[PDB]
């Protein structure tokens, strides 16, 4: 009798039309054969549908409805070009999504809806719009990056889904690194969050991506910051503010969960020594004053207003001296973290021995001792008694010496009691005495 | 020539430039549609390669320079004065051919339309001038359909110029097509251009054709045909009455139409004059009819508010009495026995006159024509037959 | 939710139904053509229209071959229809060969060979599911050494003067992967740490063994049966403006896979016992090398003296002297 | 700035009081004769509470002056109707709006 | 407007004006749609919908303008999340079964109790006397019931007219008669306005025999042009998607 089923009816009519006439419209032929294939592969329909199927209880229905409406708005923003009011729409939608409890309670649903790639695509479109001309609508980009980083931090599966798009993120790594108060909201931050504190992901991280990052760092070390010299900052050869970001990413790439990923560390050190420009003018090796001389000159620059500020807290006034100091501190921290582990060095593995030797050659002990010996300015109450605190981000930072200490303990090894007491007296004791002096109430 | 050197001493390859432009148009001619698929694809490939090579050698800027140097001279007569007669006749053709060549070079190719981005602003600056309107519009259409960056470049002033093209050059559907291409490109819509096109084109209601849903209106008249002429036996004064048995204020969304009064015929033909047979026109919508809707005296499709005690739109149980004095042309009305303070005076008396009523729907009225046919609710004014 | 995912991957995927033969047989039927108002040449059958659409899609110029779900669906359908995969006697052998000839005819009479060449040409040497499915279809229609299909492909290539086909074949050869000992060591340290990756299979080593084997089985079947003319065409594309030496590219890939195998051996030189993953990597790499060797053998048989000289002057002997060492120690 | 021409009379005793929603059928028009809005077109009575600053003021005073069941013509000067800016996309700048308003019910 | 059948210039210009009206409100420009509701209103739209003597180009333009102005945003909204299935696990969800009864016969597609989460209907009434700006959110309201009844009545008449192979289809060609009407019907189906007996009648129109509940041929065997065949394929694809969603809901219920 009759076909009696939609499947049989479609299978009959498609073939009937096709053999009845020579269809010239390509879209018609495509639609007919797609529909016929769906009829003959109905089990494939379930194969596609089930991954995108999620179940929720009755209590969360309203919150899920609100989140679905927000996601619909965000996806609708894709069809239109980016604009000023589109910024408001996206930001309010993402705020709503982040406020929704289901966003935390059901990460698998969030991934299945594929909002993560939707925000990524919005990022791609806006970055492409005005590619070379910095970034139009920078605040919207910052919000998208913040949402992506938070999505990474929600769960490890979300983090894997994010790491799957690392190649594009590193392609667009240099978007807003130079501008402060954009920090923590750049695509490089999303990449770092995707490869952050995950041993499996760190091992999966490839060598070409690290090479791309190292080339970016070389570009920063060779060429000045054009956007800053446009604001009137004094022109020096290298780019400390962007280099610090690029070094922080490598730190997160090579250091995971207290230990150091040996495979990534060895590759990073090899690339960084193949191109020695990334170390910066102090440690390029030719005419290099040294890390300690660089720190002293950076102190002088940070104290001088003409060099530290453009003069025609950071986004308004990027401190050149602090930028240089934090760049070198980040480089030293990266090297110290890339240093091999003590268990392997005692086991006597030749590659670990060699990498330690390379790092020891790269950084002399005396320079580190001097940097530690550099003292700290003490904020002082005035005659009024109000504490006169200089901007801590303007000058020499304790984390700068913390990186020094990490490098010292991880590459050399504090094994001589004479060297221990020497380091104590020169740099460690005076700082702790300063803390003892600051232990007063207001100074606390 | 611009340095005012002698035209004969200066050489202008007028004929060869036109011949080469024809050759270039043929060389960049798009493949024909009815061709077979494979040959079509090969010819598209060849055209794409040709456009790429031309853009790499930078022929777009050369064409733009030639177009600019031709637009230096305002008109064909001006070029004919600054140059030879032959240059005068060829100025229009060469300038059209250059725009055709530019369109052929940029058409279909994304990279060329993207590199045209800087020149979009310069191109639109000559959109108003007649000699280049069509070519510039075609080039604009190609750039807009191909390159998204063109939509970024287009500004509020450019949109206003494109719209004013409609106002000055009249209705042209190609300008509408360009405006459509401005709104959406490659499945992506631009809210700014959408808003500007809306807010600049729509509110005026003067360029785009406007639409309205209008009721049909029909006119009923008696058989009588009364007129005034010298030495002719017709009584110049007449009187008849109409009562509205039932009327619905709103049968449809639009208000109902009910007007009573006299009408005239052009000449001595029995056809009412100055109006179309069918449509939304009724009594008073021409200069041949005179009407009263209860509040307004209608003549020539223009209404004036006439005062009357308890003035209201003609409703149920309203008796309207009409008067006509052909001795001194004057039409007077009187609703429910009291007179309205308005008169139609000094109108044409060449043709014949007759009572008439206009209605749309939900109208139930009764003619009261006097004598056996109808009995007047109110006493006719003195001497009014 | 966990039950939904497990049910999917355990039952819905494992469910198997063999409909390809029926679908292709139905699509190849011209239905009531004389009752249909043709009044002339017969209307192309639905399978012919599908193949024509797939061919025109490839023939259209694009900067890239866009991945098409319809093509990956119908290409696998047609390949399964061609295959339709105790000791059979001569009667069974002959019946199976005759069946396969007709099943391949149902496609190659309608331009399937042209379609599978055009898709490879439009690939522009980019590895992808498009070209994986196209290569599988080509193997399906060339299986057994179909002389008619070989002639059709050679004639099409000669008359189209196609250089993109050989350029894409070369590019796919360079894009083909080999053993990556670095990735193997990284994944082994991951396993030693014990955290199973979200991608449990962990086949980063030897990325696409199926794709490499298909790409080389295609080229072996193309020269199968001592098709001397096609072997000479592969060596040097006579009419074409620019030639690509597929024979030399094949031996270059053979040298690369030899180096990969030698490195993996040298990494297992010290360990007493080969682990299961090492055995699997060896099992896949040896199969790939076997397919390449067979492809070269079919290149050089039928005393194709040109191919013989080309490989004699190539880097083949280095790969040979390497495999000799590998065999000497692994035995 | 709002005038009332009575097309149809009302009861003359009931008027919109403070805080009372007034339902009306209106047919907005420009002076030139073109129509821009009509609640009768959408077949939905327009519902607003007088004195709560939700409709154009000129329409508000017109409705307030109206009585129950009365049908009147509301001529709204540009100052009391959309101002010099005008409603973007519909009402041109410096436009005078005439409405045919009927007070269907008072609640 | 019907006098434009003989004036080509004004006909073409007005068709392009209608397409510009569609373009400015395209992709959910709710503010511009509200603005356009003044120039083209609900009675004008419906009269253009129903009139049989309308020019083909204007008919095709008006069926698209109605869709774009009033019912396009929600159609795209529900079409965008058609491949995701978030099914609350409540009692009405548990009541779902693969087959309607003990006999293993497929129920009519679409008809049934579907519990999967779905975008929410919301329309704002365009009133230009109002000074509020919140109505620019959402799209202008339309009489979705009158539109439904008119659509099905017109399609029912069109099926009979086309089978007769009439000399004059509405709009001048069978394409102008069917493809814009079928497009509006498809938009309504995507929005899911149709339900129960109304959907049963429209399915009987699509094909009587197969969808006969447990003669006059349907559209699927009425010798349609290629433009109409594409919309038929779209409708049938939607029906298959409805069946797939029913299967997913039943699986969730069993789980």
PDB file of C-alpha atoms in Angstrom, chain E residues 140-241:
ATOM      1  CA  UNK E 140       6.340  44.382  16.175  1.00  0.00           C
ATOM      2  CA  UNK E 141       3.212  42.400  17.011  1.00  0.00           C
ATOM      3  CA  UNK E 142       1.078  40.831  14.285  1.00  0.00           C
ATOM      4  CA  UNK E 143      -2.271  38.990  14.312  1.00  0.00           C
ATOM      5  CA  UNK E 144      -0.623  35.565  14.273  1.00  0.00           C
ATOM      6  CA  UNK E 145      -4.007  33.777  14.345  1.00  0.00           C
ATOM      7  CA  UNK E 146      -5.625  35.656  11.466  1.00  0.00           C
ATOM      8  CA  UNK E 147      -2.381  35.172   9.547  1.00  0.00           C
ATOM      9  CA  UNK E 148      -2.459  31.436  10.283  1.00  0.00           C
ATOM     10  CA  UNK E 149      -6.067  31.010   9.156  1.00  0.00           C
ATOM     11  CA  UNK E 150      -5.518  33.090   6.016  1.00  0.00           C
ATOM     12  CA  UNK E 151      -2.351  31.177   5.145  1.00  0.00           C
ATOM     13  CA  UNK E 152      -4.036  27.791   5.370  1.00  0.00           C
ATOM     14  CA  UNK E 153      -7.153  28.927   3.512  1.00  0.00           C
ATOM     15  CA  UNK E 154      -5.075  30.437   0.705  1.00  0.00           C
ATOM     16  CA  UNK E 155      -2.878  27.344   0.445  1.00  0.00           C
ATOM     17  CA  UNK E 156      -5.946  25.083   0.366  1.00  0.00           C
ATOM     18  CA  UNK E 157      -7.385  27.099  -2.513  1.00  0.00           C
ATOM     19  CA  UNK E 158      -4.012  27.202  -4.273  1.00  0.00           C
ATOM     20  CA  UNK E 159      -3.687  23.415  -4.224  1.00  0.00           C
ATOM     21  CA  UNK E 160      -7.005  23.073  -6.058  1.00  0.00           C
ATOM     22  CA  UNK E 161      -6.151  25.886  -8.479  1.00  0.00           C
ATOM     23  CA  UNK E 162      -2.752  24.456  -9.407  1.00  0.00           C
ATOM     24  CA  UNK E 163      -4.108  20.967 -10.065  1.00  0.00           C
ATOM     25  CA  UNK E 164      -6.461  22.454 -12.662  1.00  0.00           C
ATOM     26  CA  UNK E 165      -3.380  23.881 -14.438  1.00  0.00           C
ATOM     27  CA  UNK E 166      -5.138  27.225 -14.693  1.00  0.00           C
ATOM     28  CA  UNK E 167      -4.087  29.661 -17.398  1.00  0.00           C
ATOM     29  CA  UNK E 168      -3.626  32.430 -14.815  1.00  0.00           C
ATOM     30  CA  UNK E 169      -1.976  31.587 -11.476  1.00  0.00           C
ATOM     31  CA  UNK E 170      -1.971  34.311  -8.837  1.00  0.00           C
ATOM     32  CA  UNK E 171       0.852  36.653  -9.798  1.00  0.00           C
ATOM     33  CA  UNK E 172       1.069  35.425 -13.391  1.00  0.00           C
ATOM     34  CA  UNK E 173       3.193  32.307 -12.835  1.00  0.00           C
ATOM     35  CA  UNK E 174       2.970  29.175 -10.725  1.00  0.00           C
ATOM     36  CA  UNK E 175       6.170  30.333  -9.027  1.00  0.00           C
ATOM     37  CA  UNK E 176       4.635  33.631  -7.924  1.00  0.00           C
ATOM     38  CA  UNK E 177       1.547  31.683  -6.865  1.00  0.00           C
ATOM     39  CA  UNK E 178       3.351  29.139  -4.693  1.00  0.00           C
ATOM     40  CA  UNK E 179       6.921  29.943  -3.619  1.00  0.00           C
ATOM     41  CA  UNK E 180       6.152  33.071  -1.524  1.00  0.00           C
ATOM     42  CA  UNK E 181       3.071  31.464   0.045  1.00  0.00           C
ATOM     43  CA  UNK E 182       5.077  28.304   0.765  1.00  0.00           C
ATOM     44  CA  UNK E 183       7.820  30.501   2.251  1.00  0.00           C
ATOM     45  CA  UNK E 184       5.339  32.172   4.606  1.00  0.00           C
ATOM     46  CA  UNK E 185       3.911  28.767   5.538  1.00  0.00           C
ATOM     47  CA  UNK E 186       7.422  27.490   6.261  1.00  0.00           C
ATOM     48  CA  UNK E 187       8.168  30.526   8.422  1.00  0.00           C
ATOM     49  CA  UNK E 188       4.984  29.930  10.418  1.00  0.00           C
ATOM     50  CA  UNK E 189       5.861  26.250  10.826  1.00  0.00           C
ATOM     51  CA  UNK E 190       9.359  27.132  12.036  1.00  0.00           C
ATOM     52  CA  UNK E 191       7.836  29.529  14.558  1.00  0.00           C
ATOM     53  CA  UNK E 192       5.568  26.657  15.561  1.00  0.00           C
ATOM     54  CA  UNK E 193       2.298  28.615  15.487  1.00  0.00           C
ATOM     55  CA  UNK E 194       0.603  25.591  13.932  1.00  0.00           C
ATOM     56  CA  UNK E 195      -0.588  23.029  16.470  1.00  0.00           C
ATOM     57  CA  UNK E 196      -2.867  19.988  16.685  1.00  0.00           C
ATOM     58  CA  UNK E 197      -5.807  19.912  14.268  1.00  0.00           C
ATOM     59  CA  UNK E 198      -4.568  22.897  12.272  1.00  0.00           C
ATOM     60  CA  UNK E 199      -1.250  21.133  11.689  1.00  0.00           C
ATOM     61  CA  UNK E 200      -3.174  17.963  10.844  1.00  0.00           C
ATOM     62  CA  UNK E 201      -5.069  19.809   8.113  1.00  0.00           C
ATOM     63  CA  UNK E 202      -1.900  21.361   6.714  1.00  0.00           C
ATOM     64  CA  UNK E 203      -0.160  17.952   6.718  1.00  0.00           C
ATOM     65  CA  UNK E 204      -3.149  16.497   4.872  1.00  0.00           C
ATOM     66  CA  UNK E 205      -2.678  19.316   2.363  1.00  0.00           C
ATOM     67  CA  UNK E 206       1.013  18.425   2.025  1.00  0.00           C
ATOM     68  CA  UNK E 207       0.177  14.760   1.443  1.00  0.00           C
ATOM     69  CA  UNK E 208      -3.240  13.169   2.054  1.00  0.00           C
ATOM     70  CA  UNK E 209      -2.499   9.443   1.861  1.00  0.00           C
ATOM     71  CA  UNK E 210       0.667   9.157   3.963  1.00  0.00           C
ATOM     72  CA  UNK E 211      -0.496  11.556   6.675  1.00  0.00           C
ATOM     73  CA  UNK E 212      -4.052  10.192   6.660  1.00  0.00           C
ATOM     74  CA  UNK E 213      -5.235   9.922  10.253  1.00  0.00           C
ATOM     75  CA  UNK E 214      -5.601   6.515  11.884  1.00  0.00           C
ATOM     76  CA  UNK E 215      -8.714  11.407  -3.832  1.00  0.00           C
ATOM     77  CA  UNK E 216      -6.949  14.777  -4.175  1.00  0.00           C
ATOM     78  CA  UNK E 217      -3.175  14.508  -4.496  1.00  0.00           C
ATOM     79  CA  UNK E 218      -0.884  16.647  -2.373  1.00  0.00           C
ATOM     80  CA  UNK E 219       1.865  19.027  -3.389  1.00  0.00           C
ATOM     81  CA  UNK E 220       4.565  16.340  -3.423  1.00  0.00           C
ATOM     82  CA  UNK E 221       3.072  14.808  -6.593  1.00  0.00           C
ATOM     83  CA  UNK E 222       1.584  17.863  -8.329  1.00  0.00           C
ATOM     84  CA  UNK E 223       4.413  18.632 -10.806  1.00  0.00           C
ATOM     85  CA  UNK E 224       5.938  21.643  -9.070  1.00  0.00           C
ATOM     86  CA  UNK E 225       8.644  23.939 -10.459  1.00  0.00           C
ATOM     87  CA  UNK E 226      12.170  23.809  -9.102  1.00  0.00           C
ATOM     88  CA  UNK E 227      11.874  26.960  -6.920  1.00  0.00           C
ATOM     89  CA  UNK E 228       8.855  25.416  -5.189  1.00  0.00           C
ATOM     90  CA  UNK E 229      10.631  22.067  -4.876  1.00  0.00           C
ATOM     91  CA  UNK E 230      13.378  23.660  -2.769  1.00  0.00           C
ATOM     92  CA  UNK E 231      10.815  24.931  -0.262  1.00  0.00           C
ATOM     93  CA  UNK E 232       9.140  21.519  -0.263  1.00  0.00           C
ATOM     94  CA  UNK E 233      12.534  20.045   0.627  1.00  0.00           C
ATOM     95  CA  UNK E 234      12.897  22.582   3.438  1.00  0.00           C
ATOM     96  CA  UNK E 235       9.471  21.683   4.842  1.00  0.00           C
ATOM     97  CA  UNK E 236      10.224  17.966   4.691  1.00  0.00           C
ATOM     98  CA  UNK E 237      13.586  18.542   6.385  1.00  0.00           C
ATOM     99  CA  UNK E 238      11.778  20.367   9.185  1.00  0.00           C
ATOM    100  CA  UNK E 239       9.407  17.420   9.574  1.00  0.00           C
ATOM    101  CA  UNK E 240      12.364  15.039   9.818  1.00  0.00           C
ATOM    102  CA  UNK E 241      13.946  17.324  12.425  1.00  0.00           C
TER     103      UNK E 241
END
